[PDB]
């Protein structure tokens, strides 16, 4: 394939019991490549991430009612699969796609995933160029001065990791059309 | 120009000098703040401090700290200071909340990801100034490299020095992705 092109992007999402990484643990994983102009060349290996229901009966009431109503809580229970595996084969799918210290760490306020991926999956992390692209940053921009490309913007729930991932990456093709001036 | 003052829409832009890149064991040096409006113009510019650190920890900081934060002098500025980081903590909230409120903001700078670990880790009550997001201009910066490289050229560089004008620098660098790579 014309994978390992240098400008290829890594995008990701995970779920988390919480806000602070100091205490909370990571849930759910998943990765989804694009070339530079956002068409998506590979959806990742997803993974639910194992943990004992001491963890998953006490999180905040947020992550409850949320991670209850989706069914991952109940998905985390099911799956036996370590944090050393989903590590492993989340940079293993990453390796092949792009190369080393070339795509910053993309999503929607991907700063704080980084948080739990530089704690928990230090190796995952380094593949990674120190920047990230935070489609965040481009909505607060927007919403100053052009409020209204939010309208074109699709804001369809929560749900997987993985459909998040799709909605950050299709919310700044919108910017792409109508926001930047390429 | 205190006339736009308390805007909702007020942008809090910073930046920080550390010891290193690691907040499990790296500490502040410096913190500077500027206030702009939505449209980047500089409201105020806010009081900079070199925190106080003992010769332990100015000392034994990673080789390229000891290289540049000596030649700029700031480790000197660290020395010279007795300005402890609660101070400065408290200084800085209470000039943010002069002009801006509370949840409003993003964190806004190059990686300012990075910035916002140490703040978090080190001065959580100024964090909880600002709006969970962030606002990086280096985002912009990656996108720009992919979709429109030509913009860069006209983007300034220069020198850090001052945590001001690395600050200054950051704006700048908006302002022109502002007229050259944005619709708006
Ligand atoms: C919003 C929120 C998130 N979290 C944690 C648990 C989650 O695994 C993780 C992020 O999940 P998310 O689905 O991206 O959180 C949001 C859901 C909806 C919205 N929104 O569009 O109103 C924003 C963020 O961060 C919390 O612990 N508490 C919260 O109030
Ligand atoms: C409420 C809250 C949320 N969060 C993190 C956890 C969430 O995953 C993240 C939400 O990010 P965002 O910039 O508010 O919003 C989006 C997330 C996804 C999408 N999208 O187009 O798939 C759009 C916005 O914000 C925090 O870190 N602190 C908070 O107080
Ligand atoms: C670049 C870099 C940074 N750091 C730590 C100590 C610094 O105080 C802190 C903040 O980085 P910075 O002082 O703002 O340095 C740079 C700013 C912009 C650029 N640039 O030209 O993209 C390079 C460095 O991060 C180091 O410890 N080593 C480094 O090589
Ligand atoms: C090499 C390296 C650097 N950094 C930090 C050091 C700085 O604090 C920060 C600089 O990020 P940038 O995206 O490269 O910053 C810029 C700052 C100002 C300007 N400018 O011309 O206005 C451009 C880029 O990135 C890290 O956090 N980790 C690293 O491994």
Redesign the interface.
Known sequence: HMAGND?NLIWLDLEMTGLEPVEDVILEIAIIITD?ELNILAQGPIFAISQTDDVLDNMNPWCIEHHGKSGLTQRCRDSEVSLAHATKESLAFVQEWVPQGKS?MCGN????D??FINKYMPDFEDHFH?????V??????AK???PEVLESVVKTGAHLALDAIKESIAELKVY?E?????
């Open positions: 400008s530079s910053p306020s991907i700063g704080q980084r948080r120190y920047r990230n692209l935070d965040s940053t481009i909505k607060e921009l100053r001065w052009k792409r109508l926001f930047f001036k390429l």
